[PDB]
Symmetry: C3
């Protein structure tokens, strides 16, 4: 398992860790072997714009709607970002 | 589609954004792909090395012919804007379920 | 050819460069190292197993993989003070590149 949030929204660490932990919980849908990360990229753009944006890559679930939906609420509510500016990719050592 | 510039060259944000914006234009122009529907990013990695050396360097990943025109175009932008030798610029084209958050 | 170490272990730059250089050697031992990238990406909030304790993800792109993995794992265990349970090594064999 692996989850990466890539975003230009700056959160304090305590808040980042809550969010990552909440996403791990979600990622019920299908643990002690998982790697999550919040990668702060201030210059990240989408739609020709550097406004708040988050890209989520989940590697790994087939179910996938439940996870996407769940994550999208977490990030809208914890990152104060418009849900139009959330993209969730699922890729399925 | 997605362009990521990965580099140990530190630029101020205003400059980073100009560059990213110029690159988006290029992708759109040279490939005819829908502008706006692109990610770009500038990932500052100070300890990034190439050839056993931490000197100025650019890795450009383009994910998801005409391609020479694009590579060339980008290479000038980064040479100009980053003051990096073109002998330290590499431009890599590389290649599942997807959702927008408005669907929820 | 490319190695990226992704980790929440903060090292000073001189140390980071030594390690990256030691990894380049390894990759080279087990072609030559002038057509090769490496990087140390510090991600402080990186987690594994629900925990933000020390950890290393290594992605190796475009390259007896066991010899390389084993070698790198010792380097990182030694130089990052991380448990080897908390080190994972992926190889990707994923197309073209284009200055000089
Ligand atoms: C035998 O080769 C393998 C072994 C394990 C995986 C694997 C690894 C996965 O995630 C991780 C992620 C991280 C950080 C560590 C890990 O194990 C140490 C597994 C998730 C899935 C679904 N598969 C993939 C290939
Ligand atoms: C999946 O997209 C990809 C993946 C790998 C490459 C690639 C990667 C290569 O590795 C490198 C990387 C670097 C920094 C220098 C280099 O010397 C040419 C080769 C070489 C070639 C011919 N192609 C190009 C595109």
């Amino acid at each position: 398992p692996c989850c990466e949030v890539i975003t230009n929204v700056n959160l304090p660490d305590d808040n980042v860790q809550s969010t990552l932990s909440q996403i791990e919980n979600a990622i019920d849908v299908m643990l002690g072997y998982i790697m999550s990360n919040y990668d702060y990229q201030k210059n990240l753009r989408f739609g020709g714009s550097n406004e708040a944006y988050c890209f989520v890559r989940i590697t790994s679930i087939n179910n996938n709607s439940a996870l996407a939906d769940q994550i999208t609420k977490l990030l809208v509510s914890n990152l104060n970002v418009k849900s139009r500016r959330i993209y969730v990719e699922f890729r399925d050592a």
